[PDB]
Write an enzyme that holds these catalytic residues in place. Sequence first.
Site, mmCIF file in Angstrom:
data_model
loop_
_atom_site.group_PDB
_atom_site.id
_atom_site.type_symbol
_atom_site.label_atom_id
_atom_site.label_comp_id
_atom_site.label_asym_id
_atom_site.label_seq_id
_atom_site.Cartn_x
_atom_site.Cartn_y
_atom_site.Cartn_z
ATOM 1 N N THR A 70 0.811 -0.996 -0.059
ATOM 2 C CA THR A 70 -0.053 0.015 0.025
ATOM 3 C C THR A 70 0.718 1.413 -0.021
ATOM 4 O O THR A 70 1.836 1.206 0.740
ATOM 5 C CB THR A 70 -0.999 -0.021 1.359
ATOM 6 O OG1 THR A 70 -1.868 -1.011 1.140
ATOM 7 C CG2 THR A 70 -1.650 1.497 1.264
ATOM 8 N N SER A 71 0.401 2.313 -0.796
ATOM 9 C CA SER A 71 1.237 3.799 -1.291
ATOM 10 C C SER A 71 0.094 4.987 -1.355
ATOM 11 O O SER A 71 -0.999 4.856 -2.111
ATOM 12 C CB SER A 71 1.758 3.655 -2.787
ATOM 13 O OG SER A 71 3.108 3.080 -2.495
ATOM 14 N N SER A 83 3.600 1.089 2.904
ATOM 15 C CA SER A 83 5.086 0.406 2.510
ATOM 16 C C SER A 83 5.754 1.012 1.155
ATOM 17 O O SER A 83 6.826 1.428 1.522
ATOM 18 C CB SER A 83 4.860 -1.043 1.985
ATOM 19 O OG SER A 83 3.956 -1.233 0.997
#
Lengths: 204, 244, 250, 244, 233, 243, 196, 198, 222
Positions: free
Chosen positions: G1-2, G129
Amino acid sequence: SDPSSINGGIVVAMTGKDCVAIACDLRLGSQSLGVSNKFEKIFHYGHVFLGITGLATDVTTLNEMFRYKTNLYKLKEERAIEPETFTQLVSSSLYERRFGPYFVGPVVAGINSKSGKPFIAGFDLIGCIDEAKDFIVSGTASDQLFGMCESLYEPNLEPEDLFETISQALLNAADRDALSGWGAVVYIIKKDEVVKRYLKMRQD
Amino acid sequence: GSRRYDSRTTIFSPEGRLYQVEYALESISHAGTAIGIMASDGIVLAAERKVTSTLLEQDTSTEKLYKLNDKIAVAVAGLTADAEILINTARIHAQNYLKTYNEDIPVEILVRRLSDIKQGYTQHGGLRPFGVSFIYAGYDDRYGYQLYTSNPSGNYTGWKAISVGANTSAAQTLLQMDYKDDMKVDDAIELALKTLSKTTDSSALTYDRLEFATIRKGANDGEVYQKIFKPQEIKDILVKTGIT
Amino acid sequence: MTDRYSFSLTTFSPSGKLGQIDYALTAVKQGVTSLGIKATNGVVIATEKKSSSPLAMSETLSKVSLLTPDIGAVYSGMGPDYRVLVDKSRKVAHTSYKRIYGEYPPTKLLVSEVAKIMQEATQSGGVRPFGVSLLIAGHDEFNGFSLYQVDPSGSYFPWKATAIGKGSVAAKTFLEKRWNDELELEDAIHIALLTLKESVEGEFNGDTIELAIIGDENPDLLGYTGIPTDKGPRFRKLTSQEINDRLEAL
Amino acid sequence: GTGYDLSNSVFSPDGRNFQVEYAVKAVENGTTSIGIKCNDGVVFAVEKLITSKLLVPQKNVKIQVVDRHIGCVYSGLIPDGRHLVNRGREEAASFKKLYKTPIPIPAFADRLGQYVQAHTLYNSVRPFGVSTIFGGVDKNGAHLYMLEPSGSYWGYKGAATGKGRQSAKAELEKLVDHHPEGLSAREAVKQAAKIIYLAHEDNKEKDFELEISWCSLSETNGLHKFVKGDLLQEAIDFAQKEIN
Amino acid sequence: FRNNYDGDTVTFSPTGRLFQVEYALEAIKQGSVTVGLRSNTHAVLVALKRNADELSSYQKKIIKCDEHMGLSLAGLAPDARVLSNYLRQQCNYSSLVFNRKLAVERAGHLLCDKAQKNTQSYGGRPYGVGLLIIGYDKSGAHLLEFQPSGNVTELYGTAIGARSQGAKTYLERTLDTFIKIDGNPDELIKAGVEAISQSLRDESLTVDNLSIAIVGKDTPFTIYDGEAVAKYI
Amino acid sequence: AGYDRHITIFSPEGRLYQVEYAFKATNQTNINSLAVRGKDCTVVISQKKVPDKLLDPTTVSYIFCISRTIGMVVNGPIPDARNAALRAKAEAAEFRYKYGYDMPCDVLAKRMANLSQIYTQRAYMRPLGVILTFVSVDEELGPSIYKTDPAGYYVGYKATATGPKQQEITTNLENHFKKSKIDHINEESWEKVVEFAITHMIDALGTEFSKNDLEVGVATKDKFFTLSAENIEERLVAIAEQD
Amino acid sequence: TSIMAVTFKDGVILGADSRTTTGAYIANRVTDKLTRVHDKIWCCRSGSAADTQAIADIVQYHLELYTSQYGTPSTETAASVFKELCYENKDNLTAGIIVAGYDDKNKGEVYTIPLGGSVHKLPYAIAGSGSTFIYGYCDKNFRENMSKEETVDFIKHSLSQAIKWDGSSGGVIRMVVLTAAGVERLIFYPDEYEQL
Amino acid sequence: MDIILGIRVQDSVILASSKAVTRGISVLKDSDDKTRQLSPHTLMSFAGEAGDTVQFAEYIQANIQLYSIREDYELSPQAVSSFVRQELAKSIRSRRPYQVNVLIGGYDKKKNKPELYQIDYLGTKVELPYGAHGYSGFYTFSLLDHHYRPDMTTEEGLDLLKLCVQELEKRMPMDFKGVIVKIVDKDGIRQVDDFQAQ
Amino acid sequence: TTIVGVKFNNGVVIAADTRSTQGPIVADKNCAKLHRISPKIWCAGAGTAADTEAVTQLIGSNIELHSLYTSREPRVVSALQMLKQHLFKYQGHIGAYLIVAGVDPTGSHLFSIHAHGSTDVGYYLSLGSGSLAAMAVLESHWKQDLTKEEAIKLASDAIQAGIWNDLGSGSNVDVCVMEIGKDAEYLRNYLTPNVREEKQKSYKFPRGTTAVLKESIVNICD
Ligand SMILES: [Mg+2]
Ligand SMILES: [Mg+2]
Ligand SMILES: [Mg+2]
Ligand SMILES: [Mg+2]
Ligand SMILES: [Mg+2]
Ligand SMILES: [Mg+2]
């Protein structure tokens, strides 16, 4: 430690032509020590039969529980519970203890008094219901039974024939399992009557 | 305050009587008469129905005689609803005793338990008692045929023949008159019917107004058979006896 | 703070009467008529829609309620007490039965359960009995068809036909003549319609009558196909039009 | 019949709640206190009856702050007011803990309201014997409020309560009519002292101690602070002056 | 009238009175007299103790709450016990948790809130005792008067109990004089005794009869009874 | 016994007096309101009476915004009214969270009625002296108006009115509907429906209105809002050029 | 996930990828990790899906109720609710959330609530992440009071890098623009962001 | 473990139980009675964890004694056992299960037949001609499987127990210090005071 | 177990295989993995057998009661929100992985719920040990605007991928098509490609083969 492997035992039920049969072995032991040569695992509340394999203490406990539950039922409803229904009672009664189950493997067999169709079913220790048309196996010798049944079985056998089949299935599967055996019992079920026969088998 | 609306259902009168029990016993005397007669080979429970009509369905009806377990039954007199509550709980205790000891529950044990629940409403809680009285007909290995009775105060006692509800005094006298220690079921039936017949506040004792039950230990069997008479059978036994 | 009303509000009077119970029954007497007639192959329960204003929309009020897909209920009394009795009735049909046996409760048992709820309001601390009487009709595989009445005391009884509320006596009488054990449902609907007409003061049509039945299975009401055991619900509320079609055959 | 006034939640045949109404009288028998809303804040002042010279001057404080921006003043049963404030305080904290911003006056108010109203729903509690004038400054302006024992409250341009209530409201109404522009908190303080002084005439027997407090967006930063020293004498004077 | 509205503390009279509370205040009037008075340096409590027979003890009327706070009771003794204990606890907590001596003013606020609960709650009962609280803290000497209605007040002096009005008027005149008795404990005490004498009728205050207490700048709350109060008559 | 007029228990005639006295409490304010359904909106009007000059006029309302879609008008005293609002809000929020869609008007109503039915049966709870009119434009049913009362009764209306002069307004409205034959004002804009509403309140109460005498609330698809003194005026003017 | 949120002159934009994984399998490649808790208060979600859905669902509720009762909630208040849940339940949650919303007086605002449940208000924030990789870029290419067009780019570039390096990010880039003008939904496909 | 054997002959039930109580490195006592009379025709022998043992037994005793009084009657052996099983079966799923195993030997006055029931700490109950708990069974069941006959006299059973005891003394590692024998028959329960040398 | 859901132009269809396992043993050669939550809302479940059925019955029950209480047809987001919240409360201990779809007054819906209570929405989804074989197919042949006919195939094929390439799946394929206007249609055993071939011999034992000891009749009534 594996609750399901301390006492040993097996149960199997099949359906025939307007009949069902359910049988079991008579052993009760503590690991290697055979203790009782007289431990039956098939019970019946009216015309509905329930065989239970697993931890003997739980086997006993659930029988007692189903007698109670069936009795009250009969008083409120004023008719004996039916297989299809009892099965649901068993299932829910098992799922009630989802996170601290009774270490058992019940098997239901009987003939609906209304429709007359033969009925049998099995459940995992938490209630998954497995309703089958052919046979249901349970116990320490489940694999072996699955082996005997899958091969020996064939649709619509008459009572007298089904007997042989169920018997050979149980008998031979037991002989390949250390924790089961020490005697066997078979119930042949028909609308009108039900017969109980004991089998001569290796006593080792 | 709240106290303001409290009836104090569990207090003693200046005479040492429990108002509500007394008043409940009164309610009961207005209820249909139930009779239980204990024989040497059976027990009979008979009950007179209150609230009738041409339209009421008597076939699928059971407002006075209930099965507590395969060896015990009760006849009720009072609020039919209050009754069911006690009956449901009595049915369970029977099954609990079974599970625990693997023997059928002894009639008196069942009885005493029920009576103690009643006594409760009498001594603490602040609730109204149950407007109900039972006659228990049951069988067991220790005493055999038994007939008992309980009422709102929670007191119970045993009988050879008894009645509850309306016209107790009348029926009792009649019962004390023709009952004899070495009777027989078929005879007890007659007596029961007769008794109801002479206490009824209605014209004639018709089947549709009755509930009949017997607990017989048939010789050719061994198990105690509990039979709740079916309408047609009531009419039949009613004819045999002669009331027609 | 806290419900300190922990004592019974329904006690025994010196004459053996449970006041609050007799009173609730009076409230019942004051309510609109509802009846139920049982046929050999069906049951019908009906009542009048006492529209409390022509500005109010009659349809947004079900006096006749489905408890399970094979059991219906109608009443006469204090409507609100009913609504909540329905909620509880529908819920208990699940909690004490479908969630345990995987099938809906039979009528007598569901009745028995409703009945119990009511009795408790006759004894528990801090509550007044229910101001209603109900007629519950249903069917179940083993008992066939049935009709039951339940009173505020919690007493319940099985009827061939009956009526409750306002014109109860008259109607009870009318039914006693018309009824017999060979009635086909249409005939009972009819009879119900007649018996109802006599109680009804003013307008009489499918916009003021709420009549429902418990009869044959209706697959077209199931909403899904593919399973040969659930043949469909047996409880059907008649539509305005369906009522009229029988009204115009007075 | 009667008796409709012996229990707090009972509705009379006219739909009144007598207990709430008797509570009001307890209020009426108390000291006067007012609140004047101004162009950017609110001022509160209360009459303090000097029962005797033995009372230490300026110590028995009556006005109370809730949080840091709310002022509360009430007339009647003092403890009841204190009770309401403690809850006021707890309710503010709860709101601040979860939402970070201090409690908006309208929100604070309703919070008090629902608590009082609650005290008229059961017969195991008696309504509050106080009316509370309170308010403060928040995200968007000043807010003055008044709460009655029934739980009713609305926003006010000025408000007063207690024995001097009427003369006070009289004055308050003068102010609203004459200064439609609003009032500078500095003036309000004075005018408050006045209205109190005049309101003291309805009780002209015992000497009084004046108490004022304000919350203004530019004079106290939007924080509740009492009026002391220099600023206090100025108003006491302006007051003793216009009394004649 | 009354007979219908005095049944509990959860009922207001049609005049807006609380009868149970008022009846409570009456037991205070029934109790023995006690006086409290403070200067700018000390605060004293003088209380007339009351015996039952000439063959019994004179009920103790003063209780120490902390080293800096104490009170005298007038009324139902059990209730004072219950209330002093509470004041004891609250004083303890302040010390243990905040290492702070409880402010008399706050001790006041706490008592008020404690009583009030019994005056709006069902089945409870107001407290039947008034209390004269004295204490020395971060802001000097204090004297508080507590009434079961929930009202607590801070004064230069006062008295409560039977005939209390005697001393109350006395101090009310004697004020300008006693409020200046700074740095002389024995004098304030005399002022207190004198005061207490104004509410006498029975017999002159004696050794078994008097009770005095003092707290101040460099004087921990100390109880003087009998043998030691001799010099103050 | 004779206390049956103090707590919610039956009287010998089978009645609950406390319930009945509660209904009388609803009229204590002297405010009349009505609500009507447009083609795709729902308007409610209620009088606004601000007697005291020392009050802040904007803080006086018996109209509450319950949820983005539901609006409710209360005919009853304010403290019991607000007590009912809070709970309505709380119930609407809880419904959304648990069920995934906005609580419908009728459902909110029914829920609110049920609570009422309970005060009617339990001795410790006093009914609230208020009638609640819930309006919205249900995504599934169209414009709606559901009203509940102290007896725990609730139902749906083509239009309705409530207050001391309930009957006056009612009969006037009933007549309008016998005339049109449809179940709603046949108007496209809510601005016009608001007009009809005020218009008829005038024709029935025989009174003229100023902007500070009304309180109006409208409900459209996905929103409910209260009008400003100014929006009302725009309505008051639009009517004073028709009649 | 970003995920990230960037305030600018007109308000603030929230950007995120659309990948959800169970280890290295891509459970869903078109997820929406940009969630609305109020009309103009949205949050970017990173961590456990369940935990964050659960939390968001509750914050929406609390805010809805807040609205009904006291009106429109500030962003700061949206953050406080989140913080409260995240902090008070730290031992059972794996959720790092970014809260951003637009308001008339405060313009645009961003609050980041990392794992411990602490709350931090910042000109912009990044998390998930894939974020580690862009600390450099973002700290280098971010200036205040940018324009919608500029801000959309910075987010688009930052997340493109993050998606490049992190295997736990990917899919499409979703953004949410929050200004007085309202609420706009942006999306950018791989074939566009990849070769930037 | 300690020794617990039981053998049902034709007209009685004989329970034999080891007299030793050991803890760690020392034998604390050589005359322990690992038995409690539940009712005048029902005796229960027990073995298991330190305290649980007696605690469980005495508790079941109390309960059976109470019933006997309340009903002025003696529960059938079958009844006591089921009761016992249920107390154990409920215990296994408790916080601290009773770690006890019991043999219940009773003479059913109604049926006029002796009965022996074996029930383990799990509530596993079964009815048998003879039984044992612990390791003892591991030698005795085969021994009894061979020498037992259903029509044996009480004397014959005693001799059979003897055998069982001799084998255990020969092959078991622990010195259990002998056993205490008890016979449960129509006339009640009596302790064979002469078994240390018969 | 292998389950999928594929949304089409006017609805959504779901399918699932029919194999249940107790380890490497086939417990049920034809169990039903499709569950009716309400008439037009169905769920496909994989994970712990009893949990999927239990959680399905439970929420179906509460859904039936919400319908009756609100006088409205059930909505998928409700079943979705309830399942999710139940599962979440149990922190994953209820091993239910489900694809819940169906039609309601607001349209056609397709979501997925994982045992920890996270939900997803998409045009096609799959779950189960066979999730990869199925998704592979889905990712190969799905396109927007599929006909009821195309979707049924798509779903059916995917399940076949699982049946064939996943040991954790097998036997037959079950489908449930939920089209916006029509009644939901449950096609139990849509496809049955694993029929066991006729046995080579018959083991009907000649009667008397088994040795019986004692024979008796059982009493079945009261
Ligand atoms: Mg196995
Ligand atoms: Mg073997
Ligand atoms: Mg006023
Ligand atoms: Mg009430
Ligand atoms: Mg009350
Ligand atoms: Mg990547």
